[PDB]
Design a protein around this ligand. Structure first.
Ligand SMILES: Nc1ncnc2c1ncn2[C@@H]1O[C@H](COP(=O)(O)OP(=O)(O)O)[C@@H](O)[C@H]1O
Ligand SMILES: [Mg+2]
Ligand SMILES: [Zn+2]
Length: 458
């Protein structure tokens, strides 16, 4: 009953009104969202229609508008944008009801829609209004004629933001945010709410980036404090690898006995081209982003070792404290004491990069890193999340970069008793060997399928 909203820090007089409209318990989205919204932080709610988003903000807006009048006009304190006459009215009928048992003082609400005379709406405006619900058109109309004051708005809400963007109102939203001051007279910071029926939507992500301040995402996972992007590594459309000869990364020598010279026109050639390009692409990314810090995930112990040596060739290594390509490695063939020291040197900010394998990273605990680079994608799709999980403090968006080949790459598996040490059997697992044909595009597809979405490409 009304207990279920009171518990979350809702004013009892509001909670009572909510029980009386047959909202007896909160939706999962309301259960999570309201505490956050009362907390004053910016909140992006992403969940299907009918999950209770609109209600999640209808309830606590009244509280927040009330606690700002109790502390201090005629300028509205909260503006809610809806893409519908329909949705504006239901959203207004909610605010009407939940404000029922609030006196000392009462709260003045106003609809703002096409059809109803401005003279009705402007009588209401000149007088004293606290809470505005309306549609982009008249809201744009009535603000850009000097009618509707937004100076003291501390609670902005873009409901059905997906629809609002696809209805072409991005320009509007961005104007409204520029106009509303970022700090209130109270000294407090503008609270922005974004509701979406769609998740993973790029347009809503770009909107969260542009008009929200370190928002909390809410869904009924990808820690969306995280940008992540695929750089395809296509040795057919990038022919850089032909024009180096032997000024490149030391590859894994799976193709030592193979002809990988141009003209070979074999899968073995395209595979060695990839192994060469991943080198160049790793260096370029680090240069372009000017990365202060990153974790770098290689598939194997010697993949790590070979990248450390190439980083050395770039003025870096474990002996160049602070340099752009300063780094340490963390894997099996590293004595366990060297690991502990290598790891503290990374936490100290001695070296910029921590090069490690999935298996070594089980051992590590570390988060809040601004960059991860996946040189190669993980065998198990589950590990993409674990890997990406290590980027992005709440006060700094991280970035995962994944270098994904567009052809199959022959790599080492190793079935031999030696567990790698001294084996060079280039033949396939199938034919008694310690190599397989990796298919990184397929892994990506299984990964994108697991996250039930699409990852941006560059
Ligand atoms: N706690 C609740 N208990 C019962 N019904 C609720 C509750 N919250 C919302 N509803 C109702 O469920 C429907 C969906 O609510 P709404 O907030 O509009 O969802 P959304 O904005 O996610 O589409 C509405 O008819 C609303 O009145
Ligand atoms: Mg709604
Ligand atoms: Zn082997």
């Amino acid at each position: 009953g009304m207990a279920a909203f009171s518990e979350m820090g809702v004013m009892p007089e509001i909670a009572q009104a909510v029980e009386e409209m047959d909202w007896l318990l909160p939706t999962d989205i309301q259960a999570e969202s309201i505490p956050l919204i009362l907390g004053g932080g910016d909140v992006l709610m992403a969940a299907e229609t009918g999950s209770g988003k609109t209600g999640a903000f209808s309830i606590p807006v009244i509280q927040i508008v009330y606690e700002t009048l109790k502390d201090q006009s005629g300028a509205p304190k909260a503006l809610i944008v809806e893409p519908s006459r329909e949705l504006a009215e239901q959203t207004l009928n909610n605010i009407k009801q939940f404000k029922k048992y609030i006196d000392n003082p009462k709260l003045r609400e106003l609809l703002i829609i096409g059809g109803v005379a401005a003279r009705d709406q402007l009588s209401v405006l000149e007088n004293g209004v606290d809470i505005v619900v309306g549609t982009p058109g008249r809201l744009d109309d009535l603000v850009s004629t000097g009618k509707l004051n937004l100076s003291q708005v501390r609670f902005l809400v873009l409901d059905e933001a997906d629809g609002l963007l696809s209805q072409g109102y991005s320009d509007f939203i961005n104007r409204m945010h520029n106009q509303i001051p970022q700090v209130t007279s109270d000294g407090k910071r503008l609270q922005v709410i974004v509701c979406s029926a769609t998740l993973h939507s790029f347009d809503v992500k770009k909107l969260s980036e542009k008009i929200m301040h370190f928002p909390t995402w809410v869904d009924l996972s990808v820690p969306d404090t995280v940008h992540h992007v695929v750089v395809p590594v296509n040795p057919k459309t990038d022919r850089l690898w032909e024009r180096l000869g032997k000024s490149h990364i030391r590859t894994d020598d799976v193709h030592a006995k193979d002809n990988t010279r141009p003209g070979a026109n074999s899968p073995e050639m395209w595979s060695e081209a990839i192994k060469i390009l991943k080198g160049e692409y790793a260096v370029r990314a680090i240069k372009e982003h000017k990365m202060d810090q990153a974790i770098i995930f290689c598939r194997t112990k010697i993949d790590c070792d070979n990248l450390e040596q190439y980083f050395i060739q770039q003025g870096g290594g474990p002996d160049k404290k602070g340099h752009q390509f300063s780094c340490v490695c963390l894997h099996g063939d590293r004595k366990p004491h060297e690991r502990k020291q290598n790891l503290e040197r990374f936490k100290k900010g001695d070296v910029r990069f921590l090069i490690c394998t999935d298996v070594a990273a089980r051992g590590i605990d570390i988060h809040g890193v601004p960059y991860v680079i996946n040189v190669t994608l993980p065998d198990e799709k589950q590990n993409y999340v674990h890997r990406i999980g290590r980027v992005g403090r709440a006060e700094r968006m991280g970035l995962a970069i994944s270098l994904v080949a567009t052809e199959k790459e022959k790599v080492w598996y190793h079935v031999c008793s030696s567990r790698g040490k001294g084996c060079y059997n280039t033949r396939l697992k199938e034919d008694g060997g310690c190599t397989i044909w990796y298919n990184e595009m397929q892994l990506l597809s299984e990964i994108e399928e697991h996250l039930n979405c699409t990852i941006s490409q560059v």
